[PDB]
Structures are given as structure tokens and as C-alpha cells.
């Protein structure tokens, strides 16, 4: 069921901490809570767009994309945050609800 969406409701899970091993022997920085009015970088398939976090419940988040994206409900997504001037992967999600551009 493919369509063009502006706002998406995701069921997510975050990483305990960022990927990699620090050469020092030190632990990678802990992945912090999803924050409203923070622009993430979502990978909705081949589509890479920003997603303004408007609201969060538990493992639920309401994101409003920067421009319309082509997907379906139950599509697997990768959430990313700008950490240390790098787009670090913070978690994963699935589209549960979406608001179409015009229909």
C-alpha cells in the first residue's frame, strides 16, 4: 500500500549507546531520549529526510517529515541524531500511522 506522507507515527527503540569501540578503551556515549522539536535524520527506505519530533509517549513518537516521503505503514525505519558533527544512528522504528500529502 505505497503513498506519499508528510507526518508519520512510529513505534521505536533506541540504542543503549553509540556504535563503535573507542581506541582509548573508553565507553561510547549513551543514546539520550527522543526530544520534541529536534530534527532527526530518518532513512525511510532509499529516502533520507529530516523529521521534526513533535511528541513522544513510550516506544511511540510522532514525526513530521521535512518534505513528503514515499512509503507504506509497517515500513522499517532507521533513526539518526547529529552527534559531534556526524549523523549517528540512535535507533530503529516502524510506521504505524501516516498523514498523506493530499488524499
Amino acid at each position: 500500500l505505497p503513498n506519499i506522507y508528510t507526518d508519520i507515527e512510529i513505534n521505536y527503540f533506541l540504542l543503549r549507546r553509540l556504535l563503535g569501540v573507542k581506541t582509548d578503551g573508553q565507553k561510547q556515549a549513551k543514546v539520550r531520549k527522543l526530544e520534541p522539536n529536534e530534527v532527526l535524520m530518518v532513512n525511510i527506505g532509499s529516502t533520507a529526510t529530516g523529521a521534526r519530533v513533535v511528541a513522544v509517549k513510550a516506544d511511540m513518537a510522532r514525526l513530521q517529515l521535512t518534505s513528503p516521503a514515499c512509503t507504506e505503514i509497517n515500513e522499517k525505519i532507521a533513526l539518526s541524531r547529529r552527534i559531534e558533527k556526524h549523523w549517528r544512528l540512535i535507533g530503529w522504528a516502524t510506521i504505524k500511522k501516516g498523514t498523506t500529502l493530499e488524499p
Partner: protein, 279 residues
């Protein structure tokens, strides 16, 4: 002392990087470049916001109302649309965050969102002097960051060329876009004249080796930027080993275009193969 040639192993110097700043060459070549406004030094509030991690929106630090009004003032003075840049790089790597898929910015937030999500801009901020043997990067002399707002215009990527200069002589030039255009081969001699004549207007430029990016519209070869003559800047259709190997003495530059018949075309072609039997 041994006289070195003009083909020696290239290195990057503090000065080379400094001369390539928008403010540095813009003062020199204002006449040759399309309308732009430079905010120097960058409002400290904007800079502090750029160093903050994640990208927080107003619609958690955000720049002071003073800077937003200042950026927005410059934008209306540039026709309402602008293309942002820090001292050297535009956020072309972050067009995915944009509503339109372009560097066009109307709102001061549009500018921030781009700069805040670009690794090229992140390079400007932290790695501008990572290759200079001249400077010690531990924390960069009488330097400051600048926010360049260039008046936006519908610019056709087809007539954008990257021009390579070694010892004040035009070494070679190529197309900037990666798509094929048939009309380029037809007008290439005219573009080559236009770009060579522009270089004549760049003799004031401090260094003898630089890469100047151009935009040709009508019978005008507009100067877009001056990038250093170092592998840091993309050689595009040229390898940086090829650029070093080129004769800076030769009167003719090497042109490179993206690659892809009538009875008349055939025998005009067969008229040249007749001149290969002569000289």
C-alpha cells in the same frame, strides 16, 4: 641550490586556505561574481548554536533574536531567496533535509537547518587546517568564521565548470555536473575563450595555483568560488595525479565533458581524417 620545476609534489599551506575564504577573494573579485552579502565575523550566537549537538528547532539552545533578524534582513536585500555558505563550503551534502531539495533559503531557519546538518560545513568549522604544514592545529591566526549569503538564482548546472590553474596558466577545466549535455561540445571553444579571459581578470589572486569554479550564462563567465589547488578540492573528471603531470607551459588547456549521423556530419568528419594524412 637546485631549481625545482613546475611539476613537484603538491602540499597545502595556511595562506592558500586563507586566500580561498569567500571574504578574501570577494574583496578582490566583487565585479566578477554574482550578488552576495557576507556577515563577518559570524554572530557568536549562531556559531555557539552550530557547535551544539542535535538540531533543535523553534517552531535547547537556538540563536538570539538579534542574529535571526540580521540574517533575515540580508535575505530580503537579496530578493527573498539565498544560498548559504560558511567561509568555504556550501551545505550541498544536506539537501535531503530541505523542503525543496535545493540550497535555496528564504527563512533564516532554512539556512540554519542546512549548516547544522552538513558535514562540508562541519569540515569548515573543525578541519579547515588539517593538512597545512604551515599551521599547527591543536585548538588559526587573525581568522574568524563568516556566514555568506549569496543571492539565489536559477542556475543551470550544465554551464558550470571547474577550472584548474597552475602557475597563472589555465592547466585544464571540466563540467561540474555529472549529466550529459549535447550543446556543450557545440559551444566548448566559446566557453574556453570565456573562461580563459576571466583568468586574465584573476592575475591579482595571491597564489599561482588555484581552482576557480565558473557559471556561464549568455556570453558571461561568472566566477562562483576559488578553491585551493590541492586534492582537498574535487578534481572531478581529473585525477590529482593527472593535474600534477600537466604542462603549465602549454598554451592549450585540457577540456573534459560528460560523454554520451547525417550525410553532412560524415563527410565533414571524413574531411578531417584527410588532414591527418597531411600533418
Amino acid at each position: 641550490l637546485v631549481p625545482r620545476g613546475s611539476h613537484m609534489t603538491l602540499i597545502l599551506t595556511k595562506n592558500q586556505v586563507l586566500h580561498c575564504q569567500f571574504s578574501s577573494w570577494y574583496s578582490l573579485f566583487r565585479k566578477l561574481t554574482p550578488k552576495a552579502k557576507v556577515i563577518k565575523p559570524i554572530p557568536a550566537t549562531v556559531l555557539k548554536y552550530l557547535h551544539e549537538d542535535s538540531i533543535y528547532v523553534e517552531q535547547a539552545y537556538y540563536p538570539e533574536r538579534e542574529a535571526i533578524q540580521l540574517i533575515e534582513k540580508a535575505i530580503k536585500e537579496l530578493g527573498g531567496a539565498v544560498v548559504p555558505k560558511l567561509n568555504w563550503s556550501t551545505p550541498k551534502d544536506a539537501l535531503w533535509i530541505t523542503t525543496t531539495g535545493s540550497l535555496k533559503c528564504t527563512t533564516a531557519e532554512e539556512v540554519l537547518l542546512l549548516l547544522k546538518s552538513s558535514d562540508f560545513v562541519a569540515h569548515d568549522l573543525n578541519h579547515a587546517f588539517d593538512d597545512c604544514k604551515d599551521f599547527d592545529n591543536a585548538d588559526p591566526k587573525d581568522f574568524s568564521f563568516e556566514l555568506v549569503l549569496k543571492e539565489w538564482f536559477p542556475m543551470h548546472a550544465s554551464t558550470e565548470f571547474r577550472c584548474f590553474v597552475k602557475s597563472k596558466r589555465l592547466i585544464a577545466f571540466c563540467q561540474r555536473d555529472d549529466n550529459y549535455y549535447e550543446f556543450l561540445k557545440e559551444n566548448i571553444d566559446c566557453y574556453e575563450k570565456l573562461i580563459s579571459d576571466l583568468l586574465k581578470k584573476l592575475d591579482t589572486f595571491p597564489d599561482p595555483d588555484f581552482v576557480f569554479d565558473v557559471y556561464i550564462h549568455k556570453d558571461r563567465a561568472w566566477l562562483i568560488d576559488i578553491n585551493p589547488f590541492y586534492p582537498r578540492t574535487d578534481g572531478l573528471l581529473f585525477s590529482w595525479s593527472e593535474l600534477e603531470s600537466m604542462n603549465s607551459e602549454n598554451m592549450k588547456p585540457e577540456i573534459r565533458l560528460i560523454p554520451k549521423a547525417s550525410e553532412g556530419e560524415n563527410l565533414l568528419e571524413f574531411a578531417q581524417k584527410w588532414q591527418d594524412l597531411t600533418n
